[PDB]
Amino acid sequence: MYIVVVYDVGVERVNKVKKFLRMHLNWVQNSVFEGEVTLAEFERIKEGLKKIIDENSDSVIIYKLRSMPPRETLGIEKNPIEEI
Amino acid sequence: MYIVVVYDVGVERVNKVKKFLRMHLNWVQNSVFEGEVTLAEFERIKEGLKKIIDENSDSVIIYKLRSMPPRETLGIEKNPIEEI
Amino acid sequence: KKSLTIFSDGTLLRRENTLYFENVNGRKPLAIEGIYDIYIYGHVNITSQALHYIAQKGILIHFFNHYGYYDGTFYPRETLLSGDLIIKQAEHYLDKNKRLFLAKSFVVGGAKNMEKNLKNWGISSDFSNHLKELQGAKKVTEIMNVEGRIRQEYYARWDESLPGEFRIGKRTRRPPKNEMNALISFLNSRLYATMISEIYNTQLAPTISYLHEPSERRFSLALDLSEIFKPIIADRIANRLVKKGIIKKDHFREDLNGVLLTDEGMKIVTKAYNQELEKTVVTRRRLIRLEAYKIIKHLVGVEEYSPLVAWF
Amino acid sequence: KSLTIFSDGTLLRRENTLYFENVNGRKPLAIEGIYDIYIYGHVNITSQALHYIAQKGILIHFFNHYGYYDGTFYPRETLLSGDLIIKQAEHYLDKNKRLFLAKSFVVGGAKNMEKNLKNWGISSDFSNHLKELQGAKKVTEIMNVEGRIRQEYYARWDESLPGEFRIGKRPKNEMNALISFLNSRLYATMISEIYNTQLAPTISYLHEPSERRFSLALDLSEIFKPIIADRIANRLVKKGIIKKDHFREDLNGVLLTDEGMKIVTKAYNQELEKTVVTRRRLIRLEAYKIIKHLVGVEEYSPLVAWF
Amino acid sequence: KKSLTIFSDGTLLRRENTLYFENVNGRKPLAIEGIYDIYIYGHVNITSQALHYIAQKGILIHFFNHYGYYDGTFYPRETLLSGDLIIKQAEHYLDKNKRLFLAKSFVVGGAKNMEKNLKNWGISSDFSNHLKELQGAKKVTEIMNVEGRIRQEYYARWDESLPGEFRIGKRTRRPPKNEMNALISFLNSRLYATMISEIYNTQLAPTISYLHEPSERRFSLALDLSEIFKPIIADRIANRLVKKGIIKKDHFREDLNGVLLTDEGMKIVTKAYNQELEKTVVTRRRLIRLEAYKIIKHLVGVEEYSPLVAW
Amino acid sequence: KSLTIFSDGTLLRRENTLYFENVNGRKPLAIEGIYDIYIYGHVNITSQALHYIAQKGILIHFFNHYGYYDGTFYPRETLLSGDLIIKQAEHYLDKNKRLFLAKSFVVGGAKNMEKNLKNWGISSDFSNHLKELQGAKKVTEIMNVEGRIRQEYYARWDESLPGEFRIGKRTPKNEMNALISFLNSRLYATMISEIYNTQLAPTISYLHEPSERRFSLALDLSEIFKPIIADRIANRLVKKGIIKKDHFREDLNGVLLTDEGMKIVTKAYNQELEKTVVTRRRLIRLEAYKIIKHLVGVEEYSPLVAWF
Structure with missing residues (x-):
């Protein structure tokens, strides 16, 4: 299962979640993470995120995709994942 | 064609892309737009978007998905697109 | 646990273990753990398989009128129950x-x-x-x-x-x-x-x-x-x-x-x-x-x- | 009385009447005397034809093919009764x-x-x-x-x-x-x-x-x-x-x-x-x-x- | 228009009108239009359909050695040309x-x-x-x-x-x-x-x-x-x-x-x-x-x- | 001289020697005397059996069933050849x-x-x-x-x-x-x-x-x-x-x-x-x-x- 994790966590909290998602998924642009997870690790992410992040303020979206989606990027590509 | 447009544009330039991509795609969270496009308005989006944003500073990612992807939301749902 | 509301007139079906909504245009979404309730406002055919699955998972279909008014309810079997x-x-x-x-x-x-x-x-x-x-x-x-x-x-x-x-x-409730x-x-x-x-x-x-x-x-x-x-x-x-x-x-x-x-x-x-x-x-x-x-x-x-x- | 369907068909409403399309045919179902419908088979229902049943206040009890209760369709009005x-x-x-x-x-x-x-x-x-x-x-x-x-x-x-x-x-x-x-x-x-x-x-x-x-x-x-x-x-x-x-x-x-x-x-x-x-x-x-x-x-x- | 380097050992092909990459495990990614060059660093089988298709699209396939050294190139036919x-x-x-x-x-x-x-x-x-x-x-x-x-x-x-x-x-040239x-x-x-x-x-x-x-x-x-x-x-x-x-x-x-x-x-x-x-x-x-x-x-x-x- | 493959197979390498994966059976190709390969048909290639062809400096020209030119695999290795x-x-x-x-x-x-x-x-x-x-x-x-x-x-x-x-x-x-x-x-x-x-x-x-x-x-x-x-x-x-x-x-x-x-x-x-x-x-x-x-x-x- 391939997910792309997008979020809106505001300030003075994000750095611990940003360092969290770097240990599991890849980094594409500012505040966008994607990577290959198993049915166990998806739970680990959402669990860790649930306990690191505070609800009723912030927002996190996780799209559940079957395989690597094609993409067209503009501006500067701070990290390309297309090269695998 | 269903795309999710995620991006990182600087300040004083964000409100113009937010206003541009709002009359074409739906809004899910901060700096996240998705919706159903035909392969003619997609060109209009990537085209018109190119002239609104400044490259060599900013970044825009466009995932090209075949259909509306399943998702699991956290925090506050800024908008529930998960219901037809 | 979200909710679903289908205004497009489609067809609910199963396809081995998942729910799928096929609009009268070709395609198929809809996670199974995503909901406990479905709301039907359109003309949607249900299959005995997806209805037994909806029943198996305990999901309800709360159908509506032509105007959006509450019409009926599919109450599945009660998973959590108590008599006392x-x-x-x-x-x-x-x-x-x-x-x-x-x-x-x-x-x-x-x-x-x-x-x-x-x-x-x-x-x-x-x-x-x-x-x-x-x-x-x-x-x-x-x-x-x-x-x-x-x-x-x-x-x-x-x-x-x-x-x-x-x-x-x-x-004047209705109409x-x-x-x-x-x-x-x-x-x-x-x-x-x-x-x-x-x-x-x-x-x-x-x-x-x-x-x-x-x-x-x-x-x-x-x-x-x-x-x-x-x-x-x-x-x-x-x-x-x-x-x-x-x-x-x-x-x-x-x-x-x-x-x-x-x-x-x-x-x-x-x-x-x-x-x-x-x-x-x-x-x-x-x-x-x-x-x-x-x-x-x-x-x-x-x-x-x-x-x-x-x-x- | 009440009705029981064992056969696997498709219930629908073509033009302002209830119709049962089974293998090779379509048969109208007279509901004017029914208070309960029992589905023992594999029967696909349409929300249009189910609004017709719902409009009449009839109950639908769904079953597996053999012996297991799935659910029941409760309309809004449900012709008067006790408890x-x-x-x-x-x-x-x-x-x-x-x-x-x-x-x-x-x-x-x-x-x-x-x-x-x-x-x-x-x-x-x-x-x-x-x-x-x-x-x-x-x-x-x-x-x-x-x-x-x-x-x-x-x-x-x-x-x-x-x-x-x-x-x-x-x-x-x-x-x-x-x-x-x-x-x-x-x-x-x-x-x-x-x-x-x-x-x-x-x-x-x-x-x-x-x-x-x-x-x-x-x-x-x-x-x-x-x-x-x-x-x-x-x-x-x-x-x-x-x-x-x-x-x-x-x-x-x-x-x-x-x-x-x-x-x-x-x-x-x-x-x-x-x-x-x-x-x-x-x-x-x-x-x-x-x-x-x-x-x-x-x-x-x-x-x-x-x- | 980016390029590609496919390390994983899979098979390139063209089921419906697009290229698709099957690794041994299993999946099928890769929209073509948007890639310019393919670099084969792994053991990847190519099919004549995607090989004829790549040529028809003007994309070339660069192969490389086990050690990273340039092994060769697949040169398709010349799209835009001039003899003057x-x-x-x-x-x-x-x-x-x-x-x-x-x-x-x-x-x-x-x-x-x-x-x-x-x-x-x-x-x-x-x-x-x-x-x-x-x-x-x-x-x-x-x-x-x-x-x-x-x-x-x-x-x-x-x-x-x-x-x-x-x-x-x-x-120190190879090796x-x-x-x-x-x-x-x-x-x-x-x-x-x-x-x-x-x-x-x-x-x-x-x-x-x-x-x-x-x-x-x-x-x-x-x-x-x-x-x-x-x-x-x-x-x-x-x-x-x-x-x-x-x-x-x-x-x-x-x-x-x-x-x-x-x-x-x-x-x-x-x-x-x-x-x-x-x-x-x-x-x-x-x-x-x-x-x-x-x-x-x-x-x-x-x-x-x-x-x-x-x- | 050179060889031409009409049949639609798969060019393959099996344990350090080239072979041909024609639908019905596998055959070895002895290429020592060959310096050029011409391929027209549906012939699948593999990067394993390309390093071997390239290391010997052999060039393979790909074609359609009919003369239409697809491409050519130019190895890094090359003999004198002149321009x-x-x-x-x-x-x-x-x-x-x-x-x-x-x-x-x-x-x-x-x-x-x-x-x-x-x-x-x-x-x-x-x-x-x-x-x-x-x-x-x-x-x-x-x-x-x-x-x-x-x-x-x-x-x-x-x-x-x-x-x-x-x-x-x-006209x-x-x-x-x-x-x-x-x-x-x-x-x-x-x-x-x-x-x-x-x-x-x-x-x-x-x-x-x-x-x-x-x-x-x-x-x-x-x-x-x-x-x-x-x-x-x-x-x-x-x-x-x-x-x-x-x-x-x-x-x-x-x-x-x-x-x-x-x-x-x-x-x-x-x-x-x-x-x-x-x-x-x-x-x-x-x-x-x-x-x-x-x-x-x-x-x-x-x-x-x-x-x-």
Whole structure:
């Protein structure tokens, strides 16, 4: 299962979640993470995120995709994942 | 064609892309737009978007998905697109 | 746990272990763990496989009318159940005391939000003098007939803050003749659906109620508890929808009998509803199930029953 | 009356009428006299044609192909009626109406057990215990005195069975698994034949209606357990369709092999099609009689096996 | 329009009108339009449909060795072409004086980056005295004799920044027997590839060159132009990767010859390469093409060829 | 020499030696004596059995079922080989090598035209015309003369063709002129292919100025082979009666063939391309070889004359 994790966590909290998602998924642009997870690790992410992040303020979206989606990027590509 | 447009544009330039991509795609969270496009308005989006944003500073990612992807939301749902 | 509302006329089916909605244009979405309730507003064929699966997972299909009005309910088999709670919930209905204090509660909880609502909107607020007209009343027939007058004063004390076009002379529930009676009766029906859903997820028997006479065939508990939540969710939404200016005469259409919503209006009200239903208080949906738990805390004798009528 | 559809078709509404499209055809269904529709097959329904049923206030009870309750379609209006579940709980609360229908269940079971034994050539003389129920005040006595009854049944049943399968005391022995399995599967079939009515299955009399389980099938089992479970578990032991080769011991107790479970089910399913007005229906008729008693039309008579 | 490097061992094919990549495990990614070059670093089977399709689309497939060394190229048919330019390419090769200008200009332009590269790193830089030795030399072999010296001395004086484990005594062509010569020759290989690609995109024939003798199967125009872009891309990546510490001996593994990178070394170098091959200047990749256009600008006689130094 | 794989298989490497994965069974290919591979068909490759082919310096040319060129795998490894492209460009700059090859192409064109006109029993006597080539200096004159010759060829060709299919002035304003105009294009396609099958660069030309935007050698070479391939099938199709008017439709500008006609012409064409005197297609390759042997100076260039 391939997910792309997008979020809106505001300030003075994000750095611990940003360092969290770097240990599991890849980094594409500012505040966008994607990577290959198993049915166990998806739970680990959402669990860790649930306990690191505070609800009723912030927002996190996780799209559940079957395989690597094609993409067209503009501006500067701070990290390309297309090269695998 | 269903795309999710995620991006990182600087300040004083964000409100113009937010206003541009709002009359074409739906809004899910901060700096996240998705919706159903035909392969003619997609060109209009990537085209018109190119002239609104400044490259060599900013970044825009466009995932090209075949259909509306399943998702699991956290925090506050800024908008529930998960219901037809 | 989200909710689904299908306005596109498609087909529900299974395809080994997942749900799929095939619109009359080719494609197929819809996770299985994503929902506990489905709301059908279109012409959607259901397959015996996806209906048995919907039953297997305990999901409900809360079908609607042509106008968006509540039509029926598919109540699947009860995963979580209890008889001793149902017994007690029968002891409180049977014993004619121990009930009024619940019926009374539902109303003094319900129309107490109304005062809080008019307060949040800056309108004259005096219902503290009507509470006695029922506080002592013996049978529910009095509290209800009173709740009608109260309802008719909450309305008609509210149309004063709304634009002339959007006004409630009478409710006229079905059919509505003017504007603002569809949007309300519609949001009421949606809340009715959500209510039956959040009632299922408890141990309460949904068919045995207090302020409303029960029936083996219709959920009267959503009706009793809706007295609390109708002015909280429906009114507030329909208000912040009428005020902000998100719905106009371009949306509402005039049929041959009454008024209606257009799919553009219905999709916005449904959107606004689910957009405003998951809000920050915990989620506002939970409050509906939480209040449903409050009843258990009275039935079994932990703590006396108190409504939530605050904004917090 | 009510309607029952076993065939697999598609219910729909073409032009302002109900239509049933099965394999190769379309047949209108006259609903003007129906209050309940029962789907026992694989029937696809349309939300348009379901609004027609809903507009008329008819109930739809859905089932698996064979015996398992899925759900029921409750319309908004639901032509006027009273309430059965209130009556169900009212009789539980009033100590008399509970003590009655508690006495009935057991003495109904013990007379079936008696007629079970006599059909096999055993000395009955069990009625002498029934007097202990006559006058019995508390439910604990009706239920604990019934233990003597059941253990005397087993003790006096063991005289016609082979040594290998022994019910010496009461899922841990050769027979205790074989029989308890049919008890469980009977529980399943029971909670379904209950659901086809409006009875709430979780309000019970002879067994405490404690939270979390269908307690009406639990009580009612006392009557049908000697009629369905015991009867095949006997002729299966006798005719020789089950031996020690079918049973698979576990670390804790004994069990059935994947081969044996199918043998038991195939015989069970055969009983229900083995009409005496059909054997499975007796569950629903016995389920109705309670309904006819709860509202106060006719007194409740327990089921006594004439066969 | 990015390129691709597929390390995983799968199978390229074309089920419906698109390319799809099945790895042994199983999936099917890769929209075509939006990719420009495919680099095969793994053991990947190609199907005649996607191989004919890739040719029909004008995409080329660059294959590479087990060790990262350029193995070959799959050259499709020439989409955009001109013989009025190629004839000039050959006239410039044939006429030695005008060939001498451009052949010399490449070393004039590239060794110039090297001085300005090492200069950006805060070290002594005196290459100017060697340029005279080039400008006087007439024969091709002598212009080479210089770059064979300049290339090896640049390394010698680059080494007085880096730690011992990463030292470059000499260049050691395939196979190198030291460390840090894999990273450079491997990083170089991809620059060679990217060069063969961005050359295709022009009307220049890649097989007519000035500072390199072309052969049938050889791309000597990429080699010629590479002299300019190695210090811009290869050296700078090979530097900025070794310094901040993203690659260590855990990434280098040894054979009899001690040349190889682990898939993590290849992938990280590949990543950093793809990352820095386009940051901004509004692209670093196009510069590969524009520098090729400059030849077009000199080969007609619009503007003399001026090589690239640094933005 | 070199090998050609027609069957659709998969090129494979199994434990350090090349093999062929033809549907029904595997065969080894002994390549030690082979320095070039030509592949047309549906043949799947694998990166394993490409490093092996490349390490030995072998080059593989990929093609369609039919001549259409797909690509070529140029390994890093290369043998001496010299450049032919420079030789091609060494010509056309010395204007006294160009004029020869140019004049040759035309003389071959007009001689083939004569030998075709002779097969049909018509006058054709061109000798008192070619002469203008051997004296004419600049290319534009050799061209204008080849134009004169061409309109002379057609002028005396239409005497053997039905009035319905008369070929008048140059051109699609006619029926017959469209048909031939179509086969010239399909021959152009085939030409780029049988040329690409060598290492010769197709965009450097002599009789036609090599200029912006297209393969100019096929233009030159066509001068010899249209009358052998293009013209003849048009003739046969007309005189045998396989095309009349039901195949032809008239656009707003000119005439052209119906979806049914292009397949009929394509059949007869592909059928005339596999006809033996050897394979009429290969002669295209042989004439290109004759050029390769001239560019390096082994043997002077000769045009192809039709003895058949």
